């Protein structure tokens, strides 16, 4: 019943090879719908879902200039963080950013997000109240003081409470056939004498999946991380060394528990 | 839709 919109940004400095690589993607729930890659001949925000192609040219011109401005700012921040951490200009470094909003069945805001990461570790994050920051080190405290002086959180809070959920309600109504309709998985059990039993779940959306005589063997179970099939569906399996498998999903009418049919 | 913001670190 809940929904979300998210934007992921990644800037990786390439010393001696030119400007950093900037890749950003946008998601509505687990459905990709926009992308931007700086390593394109004419870099521009591009559609990745059928329901976003309806947007006019003023949508794409604006989203493209937001990505071009975000890459520009991340280029400055990569050089700025070299000053903060006293690092060499010859080393590659990564800047990851993620922001978005969650809504419920009414379309009202549940939780807003905006968090940074420098070289795989947290940098600065907007707290749940959308008015304060949490810095992970003294370098992010420099950024926090600048972002508090410039009242950055007051615009991010205005976006997460306003434009973010308003954009989200629009995407849910346009692509309702593919976004507001879940798909249950196809299940089967295989046997591999060593012996092992593999409980499969294929072709389901969204990616949220959960896999003797009613008890759980949570420690002797090898659960591979959910993987995308490629057609906007997902896959996942679980193996136990030898006994029944447990399966739940949103699209499933009731939680099925399967057994190995010889 | 993305947010229009320029916030250097």
């Amino acid at each position, epitope marked *: 019943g809940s929904h979300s919109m998210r934007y992921f940004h990644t800037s990786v400095s390439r010393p001696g090879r030119g400007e950093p690589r900037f890749i950003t993607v946008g998601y509505v729930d687990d459905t990709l719908f926009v992308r931007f890659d700086s390593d394109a001949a004419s870099p521009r925000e591009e559609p990745r879902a059928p329901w976003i192609e309806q947007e006019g040219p*003023e949508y794409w*011109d*604006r989203e493209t*200039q937001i990505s071009k*401005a975000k890459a520009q700012t991340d280029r400055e921040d990569l050089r700025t963080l070299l000053r903060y951490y006293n690092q060499s200009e010859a080393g590659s470094h990564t800047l990851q950013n993620m922001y978005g909003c969650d809504v419920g069945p009414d379309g009202r805001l549940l939780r807003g997000y905006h968090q940074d990461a420098y070289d795989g570790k947290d940098y600065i994050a907007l707290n749940e109240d959308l008015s304060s920051w949490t810095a992970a080190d003294t370098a992010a405290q420099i950024t926090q003081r*600048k972002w508090e*002086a*410039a*009242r*950055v959180a*007051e*615009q991010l809070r*205005a*976006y997460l409470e*306003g*434009e973010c959920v308003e954009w989200l309600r629009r995407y849910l109504e346009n692509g309702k056939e593919t976004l507001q309709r879940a798909d249950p998985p196809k299940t089967h059990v295989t046997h591999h004498p060593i012996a092992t039993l593999r409980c499969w779940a294929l072709g389901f959306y969204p990616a949220e999946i959960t896999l003797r005589d009613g008890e759980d063997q949570t420690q002797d179970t090898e659960l591979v991380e959910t993987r995308p099939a490629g057609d906007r569906t997902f896959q996942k399996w679980a193996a136990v060394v030898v006994y029944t498998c447990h399966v739940q999903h949103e699209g499933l009418p009731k939680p099925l528990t399967l057994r190995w049919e010889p | 839709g993305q*947010v*229009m*913001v*320029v*916030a*250097p670190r």
Partner: T-cell receptor
Amino acid sequence: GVTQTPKHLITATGQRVTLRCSPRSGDLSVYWYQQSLDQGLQFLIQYYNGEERAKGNILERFSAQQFPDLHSELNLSSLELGDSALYFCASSVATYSTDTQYFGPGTRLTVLE
Amino acid sequence: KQEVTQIPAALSVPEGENLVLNCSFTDSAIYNLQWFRQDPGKGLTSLLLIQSSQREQTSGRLNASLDKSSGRSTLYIAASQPGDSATYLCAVSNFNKFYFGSGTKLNVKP
């Protein structure tokens, strides 16, 4: 606050004038504007940490820069009668879209035949 | 490009009157909308800064609104005072540069 020199400037056609600006201490970004009656307040150029960041409808005869001490300079060469206007200088802490600019008193230029 | 228009051009009112100063912009992809006051000899002074995703800002007797979907902004001045006499400039910030409006020359009569 932002200070601009000189306060006034009377000049003739073909002459050249240099306008100066000291941004607020700590401000990294400087802005230059031109305010006339026919065009109003027009944005000319913006510098950030010494590098040109934005450009309005600045003319080729208009030259500007930001020095390492963060103070700026605006040269108006081959002056014409239409250059008679008020030239303002603004400064901001950085390039934040959530923060404001801080303007100086301005320099009034009058070009005569 | 971006065209910023302001209504009205001038305004001579008796003191204590509530004022409505309007601003219109054609490009809605803006980072912020500011309301400046310009005084002869002192320069521009920012009164309010409405963020990109904000719909209104408030500072004492000043209360400005923002509607990007229509490209509108309105600076409300409650209980106008003679000290408020100045040119009120609507400023907008776009991807490329900043744009200003014609301005509203205000004169509050004591």
